[PDB]
Amino acid sequence: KDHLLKYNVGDLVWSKVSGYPWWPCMVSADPLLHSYTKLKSARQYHVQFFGDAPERAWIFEKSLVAFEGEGQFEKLCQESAKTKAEKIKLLKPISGKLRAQWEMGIVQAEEAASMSVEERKAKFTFLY
Amino acid sequence: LLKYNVGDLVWSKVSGYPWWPCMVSADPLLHSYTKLKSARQYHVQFFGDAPERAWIFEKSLVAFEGEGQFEKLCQESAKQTKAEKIKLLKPISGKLRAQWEMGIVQAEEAASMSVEERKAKFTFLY
Amino acid sequence: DHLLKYNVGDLVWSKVSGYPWWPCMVSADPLLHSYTKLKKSARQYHVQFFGDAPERAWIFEKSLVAFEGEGQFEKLCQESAKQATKAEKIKLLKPISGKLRAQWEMGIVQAEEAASMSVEERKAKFTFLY
Amino acid sequence: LLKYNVGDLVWSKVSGYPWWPCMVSADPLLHSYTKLKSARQYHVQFFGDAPERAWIFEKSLVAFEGEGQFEKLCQESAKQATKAEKIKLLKPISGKLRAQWEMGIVQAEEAASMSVEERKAKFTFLY
Amino acid sequence: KDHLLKYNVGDLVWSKVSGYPWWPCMVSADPLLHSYTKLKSARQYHVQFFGDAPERAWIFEKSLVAFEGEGQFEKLCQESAKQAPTKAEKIKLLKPISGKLRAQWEMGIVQAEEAASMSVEERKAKFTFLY
Amino acid sequence: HLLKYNVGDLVWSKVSGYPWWPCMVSADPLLHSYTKLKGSARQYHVQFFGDAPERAWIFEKSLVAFEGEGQFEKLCQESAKQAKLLKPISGKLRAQWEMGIVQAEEAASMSVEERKAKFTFLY
Amino acid sequence: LLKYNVGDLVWSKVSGYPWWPCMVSADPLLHSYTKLKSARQYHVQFFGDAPERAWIFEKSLVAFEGEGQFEKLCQESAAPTKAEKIKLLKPISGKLRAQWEMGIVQAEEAASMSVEERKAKFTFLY
Amino acid sequence: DHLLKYNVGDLVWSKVSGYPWWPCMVSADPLLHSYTKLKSARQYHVQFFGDAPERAWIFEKSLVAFEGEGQFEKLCQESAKQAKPISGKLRAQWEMGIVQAEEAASMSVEERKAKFTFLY
Numbered sequence A: 001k002d003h004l005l006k007y008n009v010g011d012l013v014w015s016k017v018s019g020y021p022w023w024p025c026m027v028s029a030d031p032l033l034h035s036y037t038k039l040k041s042a043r044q045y046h047v048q049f050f051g052d053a054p055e056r057a058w059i060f061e062k063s064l065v066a067f068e069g070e071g072q073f074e075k076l077c078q079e080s081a082k083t084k085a086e087k088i089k090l091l092k093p094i095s096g097k098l099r100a101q102w103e104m105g106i107v108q109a110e111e112a113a114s115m116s117v118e119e120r121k122a123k124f125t126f127l128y
Numbered sequence B: 001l002l003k004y005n006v007g008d009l010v011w012s013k014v015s016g017y018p019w020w021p022c023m024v025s026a027d028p029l030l031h032s033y034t035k036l037k038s039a040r041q042y043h044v045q046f047f048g049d050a051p052e053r054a055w056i057f058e059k060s061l062v063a064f065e066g067e068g069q070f071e072k073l074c075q076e077s078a079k080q081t082k083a084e085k086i087k088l089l090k091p092i093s094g095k096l097r098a099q100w101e102m103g104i105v106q107a108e109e110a111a112s113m114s115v116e117e118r119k120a121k122f123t124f125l126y
Numbered sequence C: 001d002h003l004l005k006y007n008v009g010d011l012v013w014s015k016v017s018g019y020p021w022w023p024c025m026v027s028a029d030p031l032l033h034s035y036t037k038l039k040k041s042a043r044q045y046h047v048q049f050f051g052d053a054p055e056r057a058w059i060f061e062k063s064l065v066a067f068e069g070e071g072q073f074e075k076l077c078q079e080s081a082k083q084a085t086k087a088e089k090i091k092l093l094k095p096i097s098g099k100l101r102a103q104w105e106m107g108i109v110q111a112e113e114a115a116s117m118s119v120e121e122r123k124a125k126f127t128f129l130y
Numbered sequence D: 001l002l003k004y005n006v007g008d009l010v011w012s013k014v015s016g017y018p019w020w021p022c023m024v025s026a027d028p029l030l031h032s033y034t035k036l037k038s039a040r041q042y043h044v045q046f047f048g049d050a051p052e053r054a055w056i057f058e059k060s061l062v063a064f065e066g067e068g069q070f071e072k073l074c075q076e077s078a079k080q081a082t083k084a085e086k087i088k089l090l091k092p093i094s095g096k097l098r099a100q101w102e103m104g105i106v107q108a109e110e111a112a113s114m115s116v117e118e119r120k121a122k123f124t125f126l127y
Numbered sequence E: 001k002d003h004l005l006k007y008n009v010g011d012l013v014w015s016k017v018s019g020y021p022w023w024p025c026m027v028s029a030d031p032l033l034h035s036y037t038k039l040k041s042a043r044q045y046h047v048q049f050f051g052d053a054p055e056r057a058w059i060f061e062k063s064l065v066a067f068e069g070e071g072q073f074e075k076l077c078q079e080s081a082k083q084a085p086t087k088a089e090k091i092k093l094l095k096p097i098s099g100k101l102r103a104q105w106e107m108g109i110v111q112a113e114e115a116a117s118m119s120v121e122e123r124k125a126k127f128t129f130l131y
Numbered sequence F: 001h002l003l004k005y006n007v008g009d010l011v012w013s014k015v016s017g018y019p020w021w022p023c024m025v026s027a028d029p030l031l032h033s034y035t036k037l038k039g040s041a042r043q044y045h046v047q048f049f050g051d052a053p054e055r056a057w058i059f060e061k062s063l064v065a066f067e068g069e070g071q072f073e074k075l076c077q078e079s080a081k082q083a084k085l086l087k088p089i090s091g092k093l094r095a096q097w098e099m100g101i102v103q104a105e106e107a108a109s110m111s112v113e114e115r116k117a118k119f120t121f122l123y
Numbered sequence G: 001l002l003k004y005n006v007g008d009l010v011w012s013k014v015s016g017y018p019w020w021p022c023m024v025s026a027d028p029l030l031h032s033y034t035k036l037k038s039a040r041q042y043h044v045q046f047f048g049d050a051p052e053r054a055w056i057f058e059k060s061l062v063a064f065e066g067e068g069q070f071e072k073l074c075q076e077s078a079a080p081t082k083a084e085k086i087k088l089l090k091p092i093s094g095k096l097r098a099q100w101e102m103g104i105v106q107a108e109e110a111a112s113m114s115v116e117e118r119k120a121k122f123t124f125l126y
Numbered sequence H: 001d002h003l004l005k006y007n008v009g010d011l012v013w014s015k016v017s018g019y020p021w022w023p024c025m026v027s028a029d030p031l032l033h034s035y036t037k038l039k040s041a042r043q044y045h046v047q048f049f050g051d052a053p054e055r056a057w058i059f060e061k062s063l064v065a066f067e068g069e070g071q072f073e074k075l076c077q078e079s080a081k082q083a084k085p086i087s088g089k090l091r092a093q094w095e096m097g098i099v100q101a102e103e104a105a106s107m108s109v110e111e112r113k114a115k116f117t118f119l120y
């Protein structure tokens, strides 16, 4: 039973990886391990990072926030900012290649959000 | 409120072919798994070493439990044209028998799994 | 391009001897990169056959009809049968079965979804990779 | 009544990169080639041996004619730029990036010698 | 663990499928199920059919013969025709292959003989068909 | 210097039950050779041109250098005299044969190096 | 008489990287899994979501039992150079920590399998 | 083709600014289908050998016929006089290239084209 977890396959989330901005993702099954959640005492979910160069990872629930839209990003940065060096880095706006790919991810996540979970699973699940 | 959902294992009947082990899946292009053609259809994937897919009517689908169902499925389809009946009861041979067998082995391995895991393992890429 | 009857992305029905009128999309040859040619004296267009098992060919304009929807198929069969050899007519009127019926149906579903789209969007969604 | 269409060859400017030869294309997933963010963007593919793609603002696009435009593009982007930004913009590309930029230019010039339909059939990167 | 069976992954065998000639094969793991042998009371092995259009199947041990070379094929046909109780089956079994199937059978033999000239490890790395 | 054909050469190939088909001499994707001796009698690895490409090891006796489509009629008439063969191809096979001819004629208009880079089917 | 064979799980040390979960494999082009350079090397595949491969010296390989070995591997590797030691003891972060973690998860799942099954499941396609 | 210094399948060392002399093979552009061009100065399209293959159009002046690994030391010393040993990921991939190039060198041009031409 999946009806008992906070997130399920196809759910849109923001993921935080140290040294990267909060990123638009979808919860998905590991292409090899075929699981989407696991315990490490602490729950993790397998996610896919939206964009033109897709990546994937096992991210802790503590580092996930349900995706509603782009408007959440500012508060996510301000809350994550609140190490002295880490704060100055977190508040700084993204540039170059990473800004383009982050933008590409948001466009994909917002398109995915306008869909039922089944359709977005069939359209946005990245093949590996 | 639908009889089947993505990941459900079914037997599908296509005229001129034996009842085949399948899984209900989303269409790779249309991203839907069910549609109305007044009469409901489901998109399915045919299990085997040479996978295929199709939009099959609900009337031509039966929930998959295991291989043991096949004999009754043949006998019921045969009872439901004199030439059609003799063809339906005849056991499969050669390439088709091997691929049918391969499908059953895949479907039974899929059946031993939770729906989420079987979707992640057995959904054929297109 | 604005001077030819058909262009890349246009939906057409194609007739190949021994097959039913099939839902297609005019497309560029994956290798030759042309979508129309003269065989020049007679014009041909490269088409992709819609379905779960996609195929492609260079089809003569005489064997192409602009696709509007499934409702045209009956008249296409009846007109092709009247134009046809006594054996050819009986074959043309006979309804498709098995694997071919399923794939023809799959093509129709794809063609009708493609028809509900702007040419640019349908080229980006329905052009089969080769 | 839009400035660019699918298959049009453009130069794109991405912060930290030289003006790059591109072709306007449809997003492989979203199937659109232009969108509004009040400000118009176009989906482009970056030419070269390691292809990439992005949604670039119209203000950061210039119609591609040939390699000869690049010098003026650098000099105009430098004049429009922060003292540090100008010194960086005028500096010539080297190593892997110079090779890939060169590869893109060769592809873009070969694409330019073709009718829009033929270049779409040959140079649209598969994703 | 895998030291007790007649065949192992990478072993070259001839496989008999009803309606087809004895075909050059390699024993291999199922690309999805990751097993190379199973019991159905009767043992089966997963094989890949050599040729330009590769295929795969689960074949019963009774329908497998260790591959030494092309020279075995004549005796295999001869033994198959003698074991076939049906008169029609025998005439079919002795008939030589033609067209596309003859070419692909030939292609398989060429691949199998190349594979035979290699150590098991090397032939697994070169001839295992990707799926 | 003694072989009639080399990688990239355009040939017509005859396979029993099929019309003379537009081909190109190529290396085997696995065996990496383009010619061999079966036994006494030389074979060449070829790739059949068309929208559904295939490949095979064909005997030299079943190969004829490709110049163009105009050769096909004489090839049929000569194969018929040496022997169904005279009957014209239809349906799917006629379309794919036509597709092969179009590919072979485009390949013929190119230098050997360019045609190897463009028309060698990936496997 | 070789220490490792195709399918064996090992930890590999590449200068500037943490000890990484690998599996011994045949080179996809050269079809060999071990060679001499005098000194023996093995072809390995680095486990993770972004797989890589390399020819690694036997001296830089340690048989993989599980994640619990990593701490002692770091402490033993921690190097005559003073700068090298401080770098080696420092814990991995960001993208590399995620991919290292992904590799461990894959290596531990591979370890729970018979050599034949793990070669069929975890040999990365090239 | 019989008139140029290099042809498709020939093994060469390539020099790209900021990289060590790298074991390569002359090949046709997967898109442009040419293997040499003039830019007054001749270039050849090459593929860099290794586990992560790359390709580029390199000037003839930056190419040297590949005989074996033993040439590398002199190539560095000559390139330094005209103007540090490789480590980590790059050292491994360079090593992987040498192994591939030396295997390719032991083969006839035809066979090495069929085995070592990287698909794109």
Ligand SMILES: O=C1COc2cc(C(=O)N(Cc3cccs3)C3CC3)ccc2N1
Pocket: A016, A017, A020, A021, A023, A049, A050, A051, A052, A053, A054, A055, A056, A057, A098, A101, A102, A104, A105, G049, G094, G095, G098, G099
């Ligand atoms: O198009 C895209 C989508 O994915 C990206 C991930 C990354 C990216 O590097 N990461 C970190 C990773 C952890 C595990 C693997 S990758 C994620 C942002 C946090 C960078 C650029 C990307 N571009």
Ligand SMILES: O=C1COc2cc(C(=O)N(Cc3cccs3)C3CC3)ccc2N1
Pocket: B013, B014, B017, B018, B020, B046, B047, B048, B049, B050, B051, B052, B053, B054, B096, B099, B100, B102, B103, C052, C098, C099, C102, C103
């Ligand atoms: O490995 C496999 C799995 O799929 C098959 C389908 C078929 C097969 O031909 N069909 C009919 C089809 C209808 C739509 C497309 S395909 C299905 C059995 C009913 C034949 C062999 C197969 N082998």
Ligand SMILES: O=C1COc2cc(C(=O)N(Cc3cccs3)C3CC3)ccc2N1
Pocket: C015, C016, C019, C020, C022, C049, C050, C051, C052, C053, C054, C055, C056, C057, C100, C103, C104, C107, F091, F092, F095, F096
């Ligand atoms: O999914 C599909 C779509 O394409 C098909 C083509 C055919 C099919 O065979 N044809 C004939 C062809 C012309 C040249 C190559 S293929 C077309 C119907 C006219 C059969 C089944 C198909 N199923």
Ligand SMILES: O=C1COc2cc(C(=O)N(Cc3cccs3)C3CC3)ccc2N1
Pocket: A096, A097, A100, A101, D013, D014, D017, D018, D020, D046, D047, D048, D049, D050, D051, D052, D053, D054, D097, D100, D101, D103, D104
């Ligand atoms: O062969 C190529 C073509 O594309 C490249 C893009 C880049 C490259 O990194 N960029 C920035 C990007 C923004 C969005 C995704 S990529 C483009 C130059 C501006 C670097 C090298 C490349 N090499």
Ligand SMILES: O=C1COc2cc(C(=O)N(Cc3cccs3)C3CC3)ccc2N1
Pocket: B094, B095, B098, B099, E016, E017, E020, E021, E023, E049, E050, E051, E052, E053, E054, E055, E056, E057, E101, E104, E105, E107, E108
């Ligand atoms: O290149 C090849 C190799 O494989 C083939 C298998 C077949 C072929 O059809 N078979 C029967 C099969 C059973 C299971 C799947 S396929 C095998 C010969 C017995 C036909 C042609 C082939 N050509």
Ligand SMILES: O=C1COc2cc(C(=O)N(Cc3cccs3)C3CC3)ccc2N1
Pocket: E052, E099, E100, E103, E104, F014, F015, F018, F019, F021, F048, F049, F050, F051, F052, F053, F054, F055, F056, F093, F096, F097, F099, F100
């Ligand atoms: O597009 C194409 C090209 O290749 C074909 C080969 C065949 C085809 O079946 N053959 C026979 C073969 C022998 C070895 C493998 S294939 C060749 C014509 C003689 C049929 C249709 C094709 N369509």
Ligand SMILES: O=C1COc2cc(C(=O)N(Cc3cccs3)C3CC3)ccc2N1
Pocket: G013, G014, G017, G018, G020, G046, G047, G048, G049, G050, G051, G052, G053, G054, G096, G099, G100, G102, G103, H088, H089, H092, H093
């Ligand atoms: O998912 C993964 C798995 O492989 C990686 C290798 C590397 C990685 O860069 N290396 C060094 C290499 C040497 C030869 C080629 S790659 C290995 C860790 C030592 C970095 C990140 C990875 N992420």
Ligand SMILES: O=C1COc2cc(C(=O)N(Cc3cccs3)C3CC3)ccc2N1
Pocket: D049, D095, D096, D099, D100, H015, H016, H019, H020, H022, H048, H049, H050, H051, H052, H053, H054, H055, H056, H090, H093, H094, H096, H097
């Ligand atoms: O496996 C490999 C082979 O190719 C490489 C190229 C490079 C590499 O970056 N280059 C520079 C390039 C110029 C054009 C595109 S790439 C070449 C060494 C000079 C780095 C690592 C590699 N690893």
